[PDB]
Design a protein around this ligand. Sequence first.
Ligand SMILES: *[C@@H]1O[C@H](CO)[C@@H](O[C@@H]2O[C@H](CO)[C@@H](O[C@@H]3O[C@H](CO[C@@H]4O[C@H](CO)[C@@H](O)[C@H](O[C@@H]5O[C@H](CO)[C@@H](O)[C@H](O)[C@@H]5O)[C@@H]4O)[C@@H](O)[C@H](O[C@@H]4O[C@H](CO)[C@@H](O)[C@H](O)[C@@H]4O)[C@@H]3O)[C@H](O)[C@H]2NC(C)=O)[C@H](O)[C@H]1NC(C)=O
Ligand SMILES: *[C@@H]1O[C@H](CO)[C@@H](O[C@@H]2O[C@H](CO)[C@@H](O[C@@H]3O[C@H](CO)[C@@H](O)[C@H](O)[C@@H]3O)[C@H](O)[C@H]2NC(C)=O)[C@H](O)[C@H]1NC(C)=O
Ligand SMILES: N#C[C@@H]1CCCN(C(=O)c2cnc(NC3(c4cncnc4)CC3)nc2)C1
Ligand SMILES: *[C@@H]1O[C@H](CO)[C@@H](O)[C@H](O)[C@H]1NC(C)=O
Ligand SMILES: *[C@@H]1O[C@H](CO)[C@@H](O)[C@H](O)[C@H]1NC(C)=O
Ligand code: NA
Length: 461
Amino acid sequence: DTFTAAVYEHAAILPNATLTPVSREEALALMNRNLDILEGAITSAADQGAHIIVTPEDAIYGWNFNRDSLYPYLEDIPDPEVNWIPCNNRNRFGQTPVQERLSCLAKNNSIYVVANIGDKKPCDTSDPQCPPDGRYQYNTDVVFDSQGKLVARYHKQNLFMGENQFNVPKEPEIVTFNTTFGSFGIFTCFDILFHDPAVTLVKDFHVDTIVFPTAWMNVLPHLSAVEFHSAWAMGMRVNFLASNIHYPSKKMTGSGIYAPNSSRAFHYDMKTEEGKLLLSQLDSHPSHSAVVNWTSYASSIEALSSGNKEFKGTVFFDEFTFVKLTGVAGNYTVCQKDLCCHLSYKMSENIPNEVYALGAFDGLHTVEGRYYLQICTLLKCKTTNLNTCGDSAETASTRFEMFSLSGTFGTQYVFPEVLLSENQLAPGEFQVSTDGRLFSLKPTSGPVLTVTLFGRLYEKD
Ligand SMILES: *[C@@H]1O[C@H](CO)[C@@H](O[C@@H]2O[C@H](CO)[C@@H](O[C@@H]3O[C@H](CO[C@@H]4O[C@H](CO)[C@@H](O)[C@H](O[C@@H]5O[C@H](CO)[C@@H](O)[C@H](O)[C@@H]5O)[C@@H]4O)[C@@H](O)[C@H](O[C@@H]4O[C@H](CO)[C@@H](O)[C@H](O)[C@@H]4O)[C@@H]3O)[C@H](O)[C@H]2NC(C)=O)[C@H](O)[C@H]1NC(C)=O
Ligand SMILES: *[C@@H]1O[C@H](CO)[C@@H](O[C@@H]2O[C@H](CO)[C@@H](O[C@@H]3O[C@H](CO)[C@@H](O)[C@H](O)[C@@H]3O)[C@H](O)[C@H]2NC(C)=O)[C@H](O)[C@H]1NC(C)=O
Ligand SMILES: N#C[C@@H]1CCCN(C(=O)c2cnc(NC3(c4cncnc4)CC3)nc2)C1
Ligand SMILES: *[C@@H]1O[C@H](CO)[C@@H](O)[C@H](O)[C@H]1NC(C)=O
Ligand SMILES: *[C@@H]1O[C@H](CO)[C@@H](O)[C@H](O)[C@H]1NC(C)=O
Ligand code: NA
């Protein structure tokens, strides 16, 4: 059993902004301008045989708001158990034009529609957790099935810095929807960096596929959208539908359809101001059974390199312990605290003025969010100057003939990243072993930007 998946990267129409909150008529007019663009993508996806389409987070109203400027864009999204086809019973819950439009878009095109809108929940001064505003506001994903029915409502758990227009739910919402093409889980953007609901959906609810609306700001060398999202899909052994905002000015680009074995289709574009519809087939019930012990090989072996020239290098505000790669072939081991990284490599050639390092990181990230990390990285240094290792590098010339990366990870949640020049994925050029090794299967098709094993220690957050 297979199905055709679709994702749309959206060049959104943002509100003029701001000073005084707009009227509902003004807020709706803008939302409709974006909805007409998404209508265009939903119709082509359906015309091309897609069973489901994901549209990005904030695709309908943007990310620039305060609680009051956001209010006019919000709808009361009922509990999905309510059993409702907004396209067929338009006024069941009062004024809900966005839900009606999304419902008609899913019904008329006979396709599942995943979209991200805003929820309003009026509350009383009686309940303690009610805001002084008199309402809860949530960044909400909605799923409409092929018949137009609301089958999922998900309020974002992990709000990012400056998402002050939204509220965090009391308890994490573990939202799934079942179809004839597998069990589906859903979460949004920053959620992918945390345990709840992200990990829970995969390990406890045994979902086949994750639908992921995102408005992601790219951060090289490890946190580029296509790079990390496909890494997470591979590490969690699940299908992954990533639909991103297209805004190169904020480094927003990178949508794709990912399988447990490799990427299936991806899109990265920093040049044009245009959106992109992507389609690809996936297995409805992929195998999830391929277990990896991430510390096995690494904890067995002894240090591959002795007495080495080591230095501190900054990666996304985190101080990694590096070791320069001297030679067109080598065996290095670098440790930072509880983590020890091993690398075996052989380059296609020894390209001049191109420096590579092997890095190790064991510690807590605190800049613009807090999360414990354990990272082993083979990265291309931006320049020859060793103090530029870990700074975002977008191009490279060194193809590798072979690589094998591993670490003494104190976690079972490790995401294998392989990124080529210029933000290109490498399907299916690498594989992960039951031993916890990220290794090449053929020489890389393009130059290497990074080969990382991105570890996550949820308890140490
Ligand atoms: C979400 O929806 C899915 C899809 O509808 C739900 O999963 C279904 O659950 C049914 C009830 O448990 C399952 O029915 C039983 O099937 C077995 C036969 O085995 C299956 O053969 C199928 C056809 O060849 C095949 O599709 C199926 O799935 C596969 O399972 C293998 C592992 O075995 C896995 O590798 C694949 O990836 C895939 O998952 C099985 O191989 C029948 O023997 C069984 O007996 C009957 O019980 C009936 C009463 O329920 C009775 O009517 C009848 O007389 C028999 O006694 C069931 O018919 C069905 O397999 C399963 N479908 C899939 C694709 O998994 C899931 O439960 C829903 N989840 C939630 C949370 O609601
Ligand atoms: C993944 O592989 C590693 C390596 O085998 C596993 O870790 C190891 O787990 C064993 C327990 O089965 C630990 O052994 C214990 O050692 C202590 C002394 O250190 C001793 O007192 C105990 O009697 C026992 O022998 C071992 O130390 C530990 N090693 C490391 C590096 O953590 C890991 O648990 C495997 N995980 C899975 C789920 O397969
Ligand atoms: N702008 C805007 C968005 C609007 C939607 C809410 N946002 C996020 O959840 C969000 C979170 N994180 C990122 N990107 C990374 C990051 C970037 N810089 C610092 N910390 C992490 C790389 C993780 N991208 C988006 C921010
Ligand atoms: C969907 O179709 C119905 C009639 O078939 C129509 O009333 C409705 O406006 C359509 N909506 C969209 C958004 O296509
Ligand atoms: C690296 O290690 C492998 C495996 O032990 C070995 O075959 C290879 O010759 C080594 N290369 C260098 C240059 O140390
Ligand atoms: Na805000």
